């Protein structure tokens, strides 16, 4: 189910979302708020707003909706009485599972599994989903240290009241221009933008830097081969550097893209250089496809670009899998119960869901169609790069995970406005950076489509 | 709609639910699970597993089912054609909420506001709710001291990297048997059992004793008062000493009664003292109504008892409330977007049967309901203490928030074990307590039903 095209009645936001942001605005900070919308009358790429105005979405919540609004497969699974439960009766699933768990996690997550992960656990979103990576990472650390033996006395009586050894020193590397939550663990990861960090304690753990890649491609093939290598050298001396400084280097968690921080890219060979120098220094391997995840790069994992059989030891996903959770190794398999868990630890409801969304994403091919549909846009991209240079640079993107940068804040900002009040919905990253996340069931005729509206956008710009 | 009484057919687990945990554990430790459900089979007070057998939940998913299962005036919800969006179309809530939105929380949560607390914001879980508590503290007590002076640019850099100045070294302060979430953040402030804190990196915060009172409260009347008042004298100098320490004292968070600590109870007194302490010295006053919120101690948010006008800063909730989130005072509100902030930050779907929930609490007169049933459960507990004192102590509760204690864990664990095959499902906390968390809809003749298949457990025990 699609409509044919947008239809705006208004400027956006309209007044009856000016009047709906008006009133939130008492209850809390509805700043961020772009507008107020009708999802009852949203139906596939397209979001309607309160005021009618029919826009392309191809923001998708912060790439959050997989398959499109109002998807009729999920309306189905809605209306059947056998799933009445699922949506109203919320377990604690930590402890009693209902009997359908295990087969509906086969039919979801168990079925997309990254290579050589075996475990499966369950998380509610993409910040408690990276924390508890964090957690299980340290546990494995010093499970290596204290071998196959017991909890000593010292450390069960200083872990209580937050001390070493009980609680150890331990840090997770992380890379500049990331973003992995915004929890207080999840945060100290997190190198997006001051804003999101500033006045909130945090932990000393390494920072490194993130590849910058020169564009266009073909004509920076060294500079970019050496800019990865040097960050490649910064990342091993820093795990050295804090060996030294005895807060070990436990793991290394890095996007494969990193989003929130300005759709950066690096070489799958980057990766694949990050994932041995990880192992090397026994450091876990965290992967964070929260974003990245859920196929919109032409592959279900982002990762899966790597080409590896040990891509990684822990991978977390959330947003488009419509739940949180992270996959990992058998040899990360918490030794015990009550260490890796809180209450919900996800939600049935969305694996109902999510069991069938994976079932269209497979039934109607849509990890090709993302990467066909990509290229349609990524194409479109580089012939309006080509044709306006004094707007559009650093065309980039995978799949339909693309963008482009901008001279600055305010024209970013700007063409976002102009294109939202035209009908198109994009999102910025970044200072400078306008970002597509197409939810999977955008098909190429909608990066024409765009592409025909935003071309007449930048003549008149 | 609620079944009789319980009637068994195996013991628990059972031969099904073994299988089914037998499956689970390949891809996870399954450890804690209980046993598996037929959540479609529950109803009421009634939770229903796979081999068929029907107990009387008192646990109801470890305090997080408000009116019970498969509650008819949900199921109607769920069955309406209106709402199936809300199931489908998740938001990132924080951008572009729905267009019910604010009515619908005008129906629930600002229908049940704390005392004081205009602000609101909406949570996934518990655990985040508590962290993003403690950041809107931070960022708030930092406010306090940069007054009308602007963010600097030795802290606008620092704060990218991890240090001071832009990431201050400021704490929150927290009680010994507390439990707050498992999150990095919460964690440091959670004082449970080692095995939830042992191996994870924690923060120097200080740590307070928490009352712990002598029973009867009757006969000890001093003694109790004295213990109190030590706490009190305690929590003072800690704030002072980290004041000096100069890792500032932000907030306190505590929660009205401890739960996975051990259930334990202080007085109003107590709390209305805490309160005063806090803003003595500037710290935000921080309650965690988590697992207390939501009726079942005889008033919706526990911190009512204690009858204060100004009872809080900021209060969490979740569980019971489907959501989480935390309401807090206008002067906390943060002065930004994007800083307290995340993708989802709830769901519009549990919003929806929340503010059923409510209506049914108040239409049928739960709280007051909690209270009456809870003095009939104290009452025989009470009763039972007096005719088993060698395994039945410290009797204790509020509404039906009640507990005792049993001389050792495993007389504790055997207690549980006999009285889930008998029919009952209790939940335990601390090391030797058993606890109480029924559900809303738990009435007299449900504590009478378990008053006597316990006391006979108790005699041939
Ligand atoms: C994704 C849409 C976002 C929104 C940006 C923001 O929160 O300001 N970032 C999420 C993110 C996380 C945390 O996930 P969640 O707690 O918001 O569900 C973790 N990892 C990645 C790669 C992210 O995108
Ligand atoms: C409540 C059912 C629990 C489960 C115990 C556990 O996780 O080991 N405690 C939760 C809780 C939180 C954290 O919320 P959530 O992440 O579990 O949803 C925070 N504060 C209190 C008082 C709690 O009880
Ligand atoms: S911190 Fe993930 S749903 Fe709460």
Redesign the interface.
């Known amino acids: 189910f699609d409509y044919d095209g947008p239809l705006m009645k208004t400027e956006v936001p309209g007044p009856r979302s000016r009047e ?1 942001m008006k ?2 605005n ?15 009358e ?1 139906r596939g790429n397209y ?1 309607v707003d ?1 005021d009618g105005n029919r826009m392309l979405d191809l923001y998708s ?2 790439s ?2 997989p398959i499109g ?3 009729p497969a ?2 189905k ?3 059947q009485p ?1 799933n ?9 699933l ?6 359908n ?2 087969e509906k ?1 086969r039919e979801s997550l ?1 079925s997309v599994a990254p290579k050589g992960m ?4 369950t998380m ?5 989903s990276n ?2 990576a ?2 299980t990472i ?2 494995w ?3 290596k240290e204290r071998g196959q033996s017991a ?1 000593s006395k010292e ?3 200083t ?5 070493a050894p ?6 997770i590397l992380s890379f ?1 221009g990331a973003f992995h ?5 999840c945060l ?1 990861t997190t ?1 997006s ?13 390494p ?1 490194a830097p993130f590849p910058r890649l020169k564009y266009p491609l073909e004509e920076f093939v060294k500079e970019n081969q050496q800019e990865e290598a040097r960050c490649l050298e910064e990342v091993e001396d820093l795990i050295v550097k804090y060996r030294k400084k005895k807060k070990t280097v436990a793991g290394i968690i890095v996007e494969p893209i990193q989003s929130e921080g300005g759709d950066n890219h690096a070489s799958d060979d980057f990766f694949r250089k990050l994932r041995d120098i990880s192992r090397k220094h026994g450091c876990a391997f965290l992967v964070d496809e929260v974003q990245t995840g859920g196929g919109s790069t032409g592959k279900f994992w982002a990762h899966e670009h790597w080409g590896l059989d040990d891509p990684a030891d822990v991978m977390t996903f ?2 488009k899998m ?1 739940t949180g959770g992270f996959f990992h190794k058998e040899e990360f ?12 630890l996800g939600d049935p ?1 969305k694996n109902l ?1 999510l069991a069938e969304v994976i079932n269209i994403i497979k039934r109607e091919d849509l990890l090709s169609n993302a990467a066909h549909a990509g290229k349609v846009l990524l194409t479109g991209l580089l012939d309006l790069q080509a044709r306006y240079p004094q707007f559009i640079s650093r065309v980039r993107g995978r799949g339909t995970f693309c963008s482009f940068d901008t001279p600055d804040e305010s024209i970013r900002n700007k063409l976002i406005s102009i294109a939202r009040n035209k009908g198109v919905m994009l999102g910025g990253c970044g200072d400078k950076s306008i970002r597509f996340r197409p939810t999977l069931v955008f098909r190429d005729h909608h990066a024409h489509l765009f592409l025909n509206i935003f071309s007449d956008i930048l003549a008149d710009f």
């Open positions: 709906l009133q939130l008492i209850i809390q900070n509805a700043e961020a708020v772009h507008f107020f919308c009708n999802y009852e949203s979001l309160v919540q912060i959050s909706i609004y109002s998807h999920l309306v699974l809605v209306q056998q009445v439960s699922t949506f109203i009766n919320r377990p604690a930590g402890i009693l599972p209902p009997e768990f295990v996690l168990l075996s475990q499966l656990i509610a979103c993409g910040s408690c924390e508890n964090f957690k340290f546990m650390y010093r499970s909890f450390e069960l009586e872990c209580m009241i937050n001390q009980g609680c150890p020193d331990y840090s500049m939550g915004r929890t207080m663990g100290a190198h933008k001051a804003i999101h960090k500033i006045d909130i304690p945090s932990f000393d753990w920072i959330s947003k419509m398999r918490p030794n015990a119960p009550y260490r890796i868990f809180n209450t919900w409801s869901l």
